[PDB]
Design a protein around this ligand. Structure first.
Ligand code: HEM
Ligand code: HEM
Lengths: 180, 181
């Protein structure tokens, strides 16, 4: 079962509303006026250089960031070239990357929403057509549409009445979300 | 002006760069050689900017260091442009070290093209000169590199070219010697 944690800041928001906000902020700091862009520029694979238990990336337009967690691998120039594949267990979205290999992994300074126990598994054989690829490739430019479709399918698997249009409080009522 | 360093006394610039891109193209090019290279790569300290950009090869270990103030734009317009201060193209064979060591350095530094004065703005994009240099060398193609060296040693000496011996440039006060091991 997908498990979701969300800050109380978004208690009344739909999933699809929050992802639109995070994507807007990724594209433009002025989507959240008041914020300074000063996150120490880190990110990459942990441990890397091309495989890890996490892949993390922060916008350069803002300190919006994401952390993909699982068992991930990237092919570079090897056939299926430029494919991200493996197991995608979770996607955490928020503000500013901290940590890295030497602290036990990347974390977010402000973790806003986190989607976990995802069970996504894409094999190398599907190349860049794989789901894990599409999800994390979208997020690298702040495009949360591939992630959004996947959160939808997984919620409907828990309950065909839950969707990216359910608010986090409703998902919490459903036993799927947990407020933080 | 330019400064090179160099086993490579009789070689021309076009000669050494023909062999390296060959060994970068595959390990077949330098028979005897094997590959154990601890699979590095990246910006120092990165993710997308650094004082060095080291990149090992996949087929062999022929590998280059880019030295200076370098930047990669990713999705920032102009997208997927590497630009910045390209002050040296090291060109050794193995690309050891790291960011958390003191900088990248090849264990067998072969030829350091060392003061190139290449400086490209971001506004130029993929048409910039520092891009076409470093991206060429991403895959072996050292044509763009050689062209900029050709126009650089010609300001010091018009009769001198890239098809000239390595000692010819060192005897004129442009390069010195770095041994073998
Ligand atoms: C983290 C370290 C990474 C490095 C060093 C890297 C490097 C590169 C380079 C150098 C290219 C252009 C190569 C060329 O066309 O000559 C490229 C292309 C590409 N990369 Fe990566 N990449 C990385 C991570 C990723 C990740 C995580 C993804 C996907 C989630 C990704 C997806 C792609 C895609 C889709 C292309 C386009 C290839 C094409 O259009 O032919 N990259 N990458
Ligand atoms: C350092 C980490 C890097 C990452 C994460 C990365 C990632 C990517 C990605 C995701 C794409 C495809 C974007 C898309 O499909 O719309 C791409 C394309 C590209 N990358 Fe990068 N890259 C990296 C390093 C480099 C470097 C060092 C160079 C050049 C020296 C480079 C050159 C290119 C080029 C030229 C393209 C476009 C090729 C084309 O459109 O035909 N990349 N890269």
């Amino acid at each position: 079962s997908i498990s979701i944690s969300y800050s109380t800041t978004y208690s009344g928001w739909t999933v699809a509303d929050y992802l639109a906000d995070w994507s807007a902020y990724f594209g433009d700091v002025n989507a959240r006026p008041g914020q300074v862009v000063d996150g120490s520029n880190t990110g990459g694979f942990n441990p890397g250089p091309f495989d890890g238990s996490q892949y993390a990336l922060k916008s350069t337009a803002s300190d919006a960031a994401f952390i993909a967690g699982g068992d991930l691998h990237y092919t570079l120039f090897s056939n299926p070239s430029h494919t991200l594949w493996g197991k995608l267990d979770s996607i955490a979205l928020g503000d500013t990357l901290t940590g890295g290999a030497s602290s036990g992994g990347y974390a977010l300074d402000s973790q806003e929403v986190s989607f976990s126990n995802l069970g996504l598994d894409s094999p190398i054989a599907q190349g860049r057509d794989g789901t894990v690829h599409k999800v994390v490739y979208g997020l690298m430019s702040g495009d949360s549409s591939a992630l959004q479709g996947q959160i939808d399918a997984l919620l409907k698997a828990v309950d065909p009445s839950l969707s990216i249009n359910s608010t986090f409080d409703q998902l919490a009522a459903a036993g799927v979300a947990h407020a933080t």
